[PDB]
Amino acid sequence: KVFGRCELAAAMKRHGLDNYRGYSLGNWVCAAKFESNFNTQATNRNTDGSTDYGILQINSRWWCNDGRTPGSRNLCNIPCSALLSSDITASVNCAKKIVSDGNGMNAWVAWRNRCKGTDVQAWIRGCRL
Ligand code: NA
Numbered sequence: 001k002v003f004g005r006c007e008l009a010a011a012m013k014r015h016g017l018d019n020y021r022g023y024s025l026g027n028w029v030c031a032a033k034f035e036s037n038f039n040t041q042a043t044n045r046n047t048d049g050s051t052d053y054g055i056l057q058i059n060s061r062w063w064c065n066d067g068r069t070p071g072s073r074n075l076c077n078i079p080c081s082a083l084l085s086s087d088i089t090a091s092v093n094c095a096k097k098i099v100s101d102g103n104g105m106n107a108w109v110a111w112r113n114r115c116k117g118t119d120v121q122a123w124i125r126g127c128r129l
Contacts, residue, residue, distance in 0.1 A: 001086035003038040005029060006127035008055070008088075013129055015092040021099045025129070026120030027111065028095075032056060033123065034110040040091075041084050054083035054091045056098075056108070063094055 003011070009029050012018065018025035035057035036042035044052045050061035050069045060069040064080035076094035083091050098107050105111045 001040045003032075003040070003055070005033075005038070005123065006129075008032055008038050009124045009127045009129060011088050012092065015089060017092055017095065018129075020096060021104060023099065023105055024120060026123040027105060027115055029123035030115035030118070030120045031105065031108050031111040034114045035108060040086050040088065043084070051080065053080040054085075055088060056083075056091050056095050057110075058083050058091065058094050058098065063098060 009025055012028050013025055017028045032038055032055045036055045038055060040055050042054060042057065044057060046052060046059065046061070048061065050059050050072060051066055052059050053064060058064055058076070060066040060080050061072050063074070063076045064078050064083055065074040066080040076097055078090055078094065083094065099105055101107060105116070
């Protein structure tokens with residue numbers, strides 16, 4: 001599924017991401033835009049042999065099992081393919097564990113490089129939330 005901006009804002013909010021660990025909804029929408037372009041099916045191979053899966057490009061090195069990431073963990077206890085679903089429940093559930101790990105949203109390098117400190121509220125502008 002390729003989500004609309006406000007569509008994704010609405011879904012993330014329903015699943016309790018808005019102001020989760022103090023990160024306004026606009027931060028989560030901004031992260032998703034630069035990680036996945038709002039595409040639930042997005043997959044990207046990392047140089048270390050791990051893969052990033054779904055709207056928030058959750059990494060097989062730590063968070064989900066894909067069977068092909070040697071020496072990795074599955075700390076969200078899901079197959080990585082669960083993170084490609086048109087239903088974001090699993091991606092949100094897992095992102096809550098990632099952003100709780102101690103470095104907040106810096107875990108998403110594209111959030112640090114492209115969203116951090118910016119006008120993130122623009123991403124939810126015009127949305128009926
Ligand atoms: Na893994």
